[PDB]
């Protein structure tokens, strides 16, 4: 029964984060949780363009980087383009026809715009960089290592789509459609949201944070400083967006919100320990990938796996995950110097 | 069939605007129509804050206004609230799913995102010159005459945003669901996408600068400086907004894009008419609302409505529409002072 402006009047203090009446007026002067209004004004607050970026010097390093080291950077640039494009327009198609606060609302709107910027940000890095910017671009979509990473990522995004549009349409309760029966249980829409994103937080919190280091690694180097200055601003926005979807999960799984989603959390805390985990494996796996032809200074396969693992446990904690690694220290203090 | 990374590799150049392939890699190295990469370029040079405005100084002329005049700043701005809470949202909900080209799919992101910031400047202003902001946000749902207009601009999203739901999970074709014979027809959902786009034409085109005229006739007399100084920071992006849907409905009803397309908005085009008169009529009843108290210095029902009139025949006219109105010089030529 969705509207793009509700008729009747409700009392917005009190509706929850999802699944309520939607929005209908766009009011900022009262909030039920301060962390939302509070991200909108610092990312609003971070607001910069890519293309003032001088990356000019970044092309001389880039191409007398050695095969390795190029497959090194180019792997990670196209991760990081990859993962974007999703983010892009994923929170909007995704989340916004579940909301039912406008602060959340706005935020989900600015955070997606946000990465749209950065998109942007990886064109104007790769058409400055590559002689031909068709076949990285090209290769986003065709690198059997990346669609693996974002077969599983979109998922989550594209059934809680799908199953929101079988909610919006039929409504809860048992249905037929064309012969076959169809169960539609908000329940089950709620799990798949909370699943969704444990994923988000996975993807900004972790897998984004590992290649940032990547990029950093050679700005130690004093190479690739035109990226640099650019993953800076990205990151700086990342701890952000991490931050927002740690609100809303825990939020979520503290029954303040939704009491029925304290139920489906803890119903869930196998599944989102096991997702968490997988990630950092893939994150591992990857970065046998990128070092399968060498390694650099300041970075190698040992290096970055250690690194995946201190974040994850650190990510995993924040919303209430047990610890999957015995790993307790960085093996890249440098990263804090770059990391806003 | 929606999906947030399509696997397939694509030429993005050679895909429709609308219904094609879901767009995977957002880049903008390259571009089937170089005017969404140019107005994101514009919309982006044009970031501002509307907390950086002084907005002080208002609430002593909006407390100072008689009560009729109180009455005609104010419907106004709870109009414009409206409007823009709607288009916040509606942009990313119903044309975002449907998009298969990555420059467009952006600048969608970069309009809805650049609404919430005009959102955020209409609670500005509120909170800064009335006692209760809850009123006047309420009254925004409530109002009789305001609810008129949200029904009809709400409908042409919701009845898009429900086929494209349709088209989605069954597919083209006839179905049945819950008993009830359903069919999906492709034509019929592009019919509801161009209409769409020609609400929302209006909307933007026409509706908004109806009330740029009543928040700048304030400005002449030297009252609500700061609302002033906001409406022009506003009226620049609905500019690029406006050209936004002129350059999608014009690329649709010429054939450049879709064959389908070309035939569908002749097919409606008289339904296209009727679409802009209707809110033609609706913004001239709006401005006896406005003054059905009394008027203001440079601007009453009669010099409104000839205003109405006179930018209804300009933008018909820029989507290939027959002029339903006398031929007249502008109205208010003080307008331009404010305008860009």
Chains 1, 2 share one sequence.
Request: with cysteine; net charge negative.
């Amino acid at each position: 029964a969705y509207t793009t402006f509700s008729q009747t009047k409700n009392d917005q203090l009190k509706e929850p984060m999802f699944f309520g009446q939607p929005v209908n007026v766009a009011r900022y002067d009262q909030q039920k949780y301060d962390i939302f209004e509070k991200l909108i004004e610092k990312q609003l607050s971070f607001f910069w363009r890519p293309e003032e970026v001088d990356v000019s010097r970044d092309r001389i390093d880039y191409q007398a980087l050695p095969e390795h080291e190029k497959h090194i950077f180019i792997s990670n640039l196209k991760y990081q383009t990859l993962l974007d494009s999703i983010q892009g327009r994923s929170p909007n198609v995704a989340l916004l026809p579940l909301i039912s606060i406008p602060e959340l609302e706005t935020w989900v709107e600015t955070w997606a715009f946000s990465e749209t910027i950065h998109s942007r940000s990886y064109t104007h890095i790769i058409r400055n960089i590559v002689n031909d910017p068709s076949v990285v671009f090209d290769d986003i979509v065709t690198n059997e290592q990346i669609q693996k990473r974002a077969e599983g990522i979109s998922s989550y995004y594209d059934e809680l789509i799908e199953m929101t549009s079988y909610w919006h349409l039929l409504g809860e309760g048992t249905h037929t459609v064309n012969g076959k029966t169809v169960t539609v249980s908000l329940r089950e829409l709620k799990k798949k949201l909370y699943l969704c994103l444990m994923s988000v937080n996975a993807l900004e919190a972790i897998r984004f944070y590992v290649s940032f280091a990547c990029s950093f690694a050679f700005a130690e180097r004093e190479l690739m400083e035109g990226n640099a200055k650019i993953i800076r601003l990205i990151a700086r926005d990342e701890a952000l967006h991490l931050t927002g979807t740690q609100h809303m999960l825990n939020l979520l799984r503290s029954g303040a919100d939704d009491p029925e989603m304290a139920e489906i959390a803890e119903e869930c805390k196998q599944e989102c320990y096991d997702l968490f985990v997988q990630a950092a494996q893939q994150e591992k796996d990857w970065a046998d990938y990128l070092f399968r032809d060498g390694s650099m200074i300041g970075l190698n396969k040992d290096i970055l796996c250690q690194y995946v693992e201190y974040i994850t446990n650190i990510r995993m904690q924040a919303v209430g995950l047990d610890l999957p690694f015995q790993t307790r220290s960085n093996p890249i203090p440098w990263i804090n110097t770059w990391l806003v």
